[PDB]
Design a protein around this ligand. Structure first.
Ligand SMILES: Nc1ncnc2c1ncn2[C@@H]1O[C@H](COP(=O)(O)OP(=O)(O)NP(=O)(O)O)[C@@H](O)[C@H]1O
Ligand SMILES: Nc1ncnc2c1ncn2[C@@H]1O[C@H](COP(=O)(O)OP(=O)(O)NP(=O)(O)O)[C@@H](O)[C@H]1O
Lengths: 741, 741
């Protein structure tokens, strides 16, 4: 029974599963999938280590649900990058079966309707919106199963509470319809201490396991000695070659064993220093002073829109590199992609890689127990050390945390500690949106029926302020009260449909209605100023630069500032020598200035040295501001503002790819991000129409030129050959036009 | 040789010509078509009376040109209504031949490209723009023949000068390309005294004839006697029944002879009085106190968007009616259509019908020699009296002009007078556009080459200020000068492409750029305020109403007024008790207010009693403001303003049909003007897509209701049955979607 072909599976899916190297099913997976009555409708929650094969159980369950009862199945993932990876994996597994898979990851939206789709690999922030849309116009029959990844995120997190509200809405809808099951909620988590309470929250059966494909031997350093988890020496450390910490040696010993190493570092600047240091040691310690495939990685990074990083130039062709937030989104994918093939053997990464894609390694080394002035989180530590040990190759997995002097006490607590139990995070902004997500949906109107929903939440299931949320919504016109029955309003129907927090919608409605009387149209700044999300922590603002920004702006760009409350008298002037709502406007104004150059196709290299924020912190905004333009536009339609939806209709597409209005039709094909379309635009193909009929060999020469074998990089496809990439552009264009009419 | 089938013609065209009652060719037409070498390339100009068969020669020539050398052939007509009639006639003649005919009449634009088209039945104002577009991007090879109707209009007229510039541009292009002919210019005119000079202007051969199918016996009244043209009594008048002028008797004598009468009147108010008077006499003089088809006309006018006119209620079912400018555009077509079938036997019309469609009658009576305080124009008189005598039925044709006391001297001069020779009307606004139409087109750049064009104009060919036009264009940035070679600018390339007079473009560029900094989006007023043409003489403005207009406008509509220079202190306030640019703003503001209700689908009955201007003067603006929005939008694209072209893209379609943004896709089918789409919209079909797939029998019931056998009226199709009209809606929708992709 522990064999995949024995289980009922499609032939093509099984063959592709062999192609991915998965053909042996562990005992824990079979036991979880044989937990009695789970399969035929009841929801399920299980825990396993990060490398135990958590995905396979969910994939088998969603396959069984899909081919048994035809119904749309969700797939919730916490991060956009992992969501894209999961969608591509599911497509590569499900091409033939006819299960059309596509995802809703922030800026991007499917061309085909959700009814045509069958599996929606969606992020939490947009899965909430999709389920709100489904619940709105009574389309619940299509949904048949919601799959959630990393259930433990529903605690203290910026987006796990959205997952909590989504799951409680689904549970309440299921309970109210019964006054074996319509929608099955299957989730995966780490070693959650209170998973029984979570399992009872959805009344799901629980199966917790600690099976690991390879043993994990966590260890700590003391001078020239290594101590195991339980304060026990396991191996007497000795240095091989170095020119107390000796962090370069631990990489070296694994290097001579023909394996790889992950070297997590606290800060990006530390990552650049550490990657450079290890590269220099590879000169003297290996030369006393695959290569061919490693040069291909260099070639792929050479004609990236940002070019090749200066620090990466002196490090990459040695198996030593670095990968953190400040790097480009395309640069990160290549560097991570090189690790999957083993081309790069050392990665000096930050804490961002902890929650990233599945990146295996033989050894994991963590430089400091303090990350950004605070002790490193246990949840992050478990995710970091969960990457030690490659399945089927490495016989063991080692994690080495470096602690010094008095800091060793904090380090030891991490090894013997356990991840904290989940919380509720529920007046509060989470409950206000929770209440508004139902009444405007019309599912529950009466207070008593609404109070039933309050008993279906996570806070109630763990074992006042619920009615206070209504009183806040009533005072702000969001919901009107009649004989008490609560009805949605024009503003309320817009907050829910656009998927905005009610705290923000109040200001946006006042901010957008401040554009009722005064507007400009020469420059996109004022229109862009209405789609900048916030200042948050996207970058550090340099005011002396803003002094240069303010004067050199044309006579129009300064006019926009006066129209939005920005004062010329105090603009980078009084800050040098030394109001919360006013400070959040000048910083918001600066955020709009950067986005203006982003849609003007100013290259990221220039925009970095000009606005001081590197490409990592800039794509962290344009892919976050593109979603904002996709919610302000929806906010206007539900409020009956057809004038500005027309203006803001194309600004989500212009911010996602950083293009102008000319390439809007051209960037529809997925193989032209921001440079493969302009160089193709200059060749005379101004629309996706004639590009489909364009000559196959003609587009080869145009893509060859304009350089700032598989050197062309494609989103989600790693690197691609120049001939293959250009051949797929016309092939994809033919399908795009054919399926759109 | 005087027989159509003898001439080389397609079989289907010949059969349709028999269907239209034209099978005998007069001697003058054959002589004109056998004027030696005219046929194989040389242009032609000929004159004939209004009923002599002027169209047939042009139709034969354009047919020969089209089937001999495949090339696009123009068809220029002076008025929009006659252009629509000519386009429909040409389509009804040319369905089978494959000659795709379509017209460019102001607001409407062809869905198919001009390259697909073969005959463009275009008005002068848009024929000029089409030829400018053709000359711009060197597409002159497609054009092979330009046909012009009423050549004599190129004199003192508001749009004949555009025809003059068009023809001189064509002639200059032909002459410059020769440094039997590419483009043949064939035109028709009345008895122009100086047609030889016009014929030599295009070097065309001239054939002037005075043949008339029926003799015309013009006559004048004196008390109870009738005098012929040459001061000779021809018949002693006697009154039959009346309850000196005795204008009701002349209708009566023709009535008992089973014929019809046209009774032209000076003013609309006179027309209502005269039509009512004759109807009352038909009570006592015919009852001492076809009917079935006459009631059908009443039924068609009963559910018109404006309903049935009060004055028409007491007059229509007796053969007596009236038709002037103040009536609805749809009302005029039915009243005129009833005359073609003979249902209505008396028409009290104004001078507007003189240049309208071909409306024949047995007798024509003109009430006064003074029209609006001035002597009646001889050109109008010839057009008015040219409708006397129906070909093949009436043995004679009579025109009776009524003169009294000392006014008889002026009346006699009209009978013995002749139509004045054409003029040039060429600093002047006609020459400024003439010069700009070429240099921005790039055809002529050097001054000497430009001076060659000045010798190809009508003023030169009849036998300084040409260089002064360049000096005016240079001072206003319209054209830049280098080493002298004149180049177009950004503003210059927009004035020519949008087809605006350079005098107006200077203000529009300043007016539109006054919207650079201050704009509103809640209401369409400010956007509509940028597309109102002018105040002109569209209606008389009542200021006390504007006082009611100003206060009851919302807090936003008053904000728009402040943004465009309108002052609250002086707004319908100082005019009651008693600046040219300021007066043309408040009047322009009032023009925008009316258009706001026009796009809000406020019914014409309410909008008449609310804004005091009847439906005749209101559709005289919305079909003139729709063209303006079609030129402001083009003016923005050539000037690189993509923000407001998006806002103004749909405002030409919203003003042509007076619809909202919901029906924009629905009104694409020609059988839904402004009421057949809303009542169909309320049935659930929100788009032209599902309307094509809509059930045939289902749309029958929805069109039957909402009434404010062939009762449904279709533009250009007279009246249509309810079953046929609804059946064609789905049939047309199927072809619209199929041919658009
Ligand atoms: N029974 C199995 N035997 C061998 N390999 C397996 C088995 N089951 C799953 N796998 C694979 O081994 C990996 C261990 O599972 P797991 O690491 O939890 O997935 P994951 O990292 O969460 N993938 P993702 O959702 O994209 O982040 C899976 O991702 C599969 O690639
Ligand atoms: N040889 C002919 N014999 C009989 N009828 C003719 C002949 N030639 C033309 N006709 C028709 O008699 C009418 C007299 O010509 P004419 O009145 O000048 O056309 P029109 O009124 O200018 N048509 P339009 O261009 O739509 O305004 C034509 O319109 C034709 O309908």
């Amino acid at each position: 029974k522990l064999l995949l072909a024995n289980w009922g599976l499609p032939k093509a899916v099984l063959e592709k599963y062999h192609s991915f190297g998965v053909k042996k099913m562990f005992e824990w997976q079979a036991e979880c999938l044989l937990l009695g009555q789970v399969l035929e409708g009841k929801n399920l929650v299980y825990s396993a280590p990060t490398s135990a094969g958590k995905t396979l159980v969910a994939e088998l369950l969603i396959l069984k649900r899909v081919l048994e009862m035809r119904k749309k199945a969700l797939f919730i993932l916490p991060f956009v990058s992992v969501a894209k990876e999961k969608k591509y994996y599911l497509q590569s597994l499900f091409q033939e079966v006819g299960i059309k898979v596509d995802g809703y990851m922030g800026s991007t939206s499917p061309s085909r309707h959700f009814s045509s789709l069958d599996i929606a690999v969606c992020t939490i922030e947009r899965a909430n919106g999709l389920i709100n849309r489904l619940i709105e116009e009574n389309k619940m029959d299509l949904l048949g199963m919601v799959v959630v990844d990393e259930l433990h995120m529903l605690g203290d997190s910026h987006r796990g509470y959205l997952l909590e509200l989504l799951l409680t809405k689904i549970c309440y809808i299921t309970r109210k319809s019964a006054s074996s099951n319509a929608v099955q909620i299957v989730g995966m988590s780490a070693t959650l201490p209170n998973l029984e309470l979570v399992a009872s929250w959805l009344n799901a059966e629980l199966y917790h396991t600690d099976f690991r494909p390879v043993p994990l031997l966590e260890s700590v350093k003391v001078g020239n000695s290594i101590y195991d988890s339980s304060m026990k020496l396991v191996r007497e450390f000795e240095p091989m070659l170095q020119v107390e910490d000796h962090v370069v040696s631990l990489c070296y010993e694994t290097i001579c064993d023909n394996h790889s190493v992950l070297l997590f570092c606290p800060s990006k600047k530390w990552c650049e220093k550490l990657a450079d240091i290890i590269a220099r040691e590879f000169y003297n310690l290996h030369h006393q002073a695959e290569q061919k495939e490693l040069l291909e990685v260099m070639d792929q990074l050479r004609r990236l829109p940002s070019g090749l990083d200066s620090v990466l130039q002196k490090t990459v062709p040695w198996g030593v590199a670095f990968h953190h937030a400040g790097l480009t989104f395309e640069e990160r994918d290549i560097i991570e992609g090189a690790f999957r093939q083993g081309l790069i053997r050392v990665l000096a990464a930050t804490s961002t890689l902890s929650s990233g894609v599945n990146l295996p390694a033989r050894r994991v080394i963590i430089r400091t127990p303090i990350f950004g002035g605070r002790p490193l989180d246990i949840l992050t530590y478990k995710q970091m050390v969960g990457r030690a040990g490659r399945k089927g190759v490495d016989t063991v997995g080692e994690s080495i945390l470096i602690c010094k002097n008095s800091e060793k006490s904090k380090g030891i607590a991490l090894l013997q500690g356990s991840l904290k139990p989940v919380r509720s995070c529920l007046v509060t902004g989470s409950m206000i949106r929770a209440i508004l997500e139902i009444i405007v949906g019309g599912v529950a109107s009466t207070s008593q029926d609404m109070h039933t929903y309050a008993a279906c939440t996570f806070l109630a299931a763990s074992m006042g302020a619920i009615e206070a949320c209504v009183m806040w919504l009533l005072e702000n016109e969001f919901i009107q009260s009649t004989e008490k029955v609560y009805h949605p309003t024009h503003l309320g129907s817009a907050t829910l449909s656009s998927s905005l927090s009610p705290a923000d919608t109040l200001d946006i409605f006042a901010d957008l209605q401040r554009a009722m009387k005064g507007f400009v149209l020469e420059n996109d700044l004022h229109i862009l100023y209405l789609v900048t999300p916030m200042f948050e922590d996207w970058t550090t603002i340099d005011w002396y630069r803003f002094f240069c920004l303010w004067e050199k702006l044309p006579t129009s760009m300064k006019r926009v500032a006066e129209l939005v409350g920005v004062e010329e008298g105090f603009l980078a002037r009084c800050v040098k020598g030394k109001q919360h709502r006013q400070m959040a406007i000048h910083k918001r104004f600066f955020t709009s200035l950067v986005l203006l150059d982003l849609i003007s196709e100013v290259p990221l290299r220039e925009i970095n040295q000009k606005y001081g924020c590197n490409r990592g912190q800039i794509q962290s905004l344009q892919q976050s501001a593109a979603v904002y333009a996709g919610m302000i536009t929806v906010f206007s339609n539900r409020l009956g503002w057809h004038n500005m939806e027309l203006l803001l209709s194309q600004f989500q597409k212009r911010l996602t790819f950083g293009i102008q209005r000319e390439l809007c039709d051209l960037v529809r094909v997925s193989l032209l991000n921001a440079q493969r379309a302009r160089v193709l635009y200059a060749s005379g193909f101004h629309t996706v129409a004639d590009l489909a009929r364009a000559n196959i060999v003609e587009v080869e020469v145009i893509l060859k030129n304009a350089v700032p074998m598989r050197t062309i990089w494609v989103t989600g496809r790693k690197g691609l050959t120049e001939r293959e990439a250009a051949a797929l552009i016309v092939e994809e264009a033919r399908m795009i036009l054919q399926q759109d009419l």
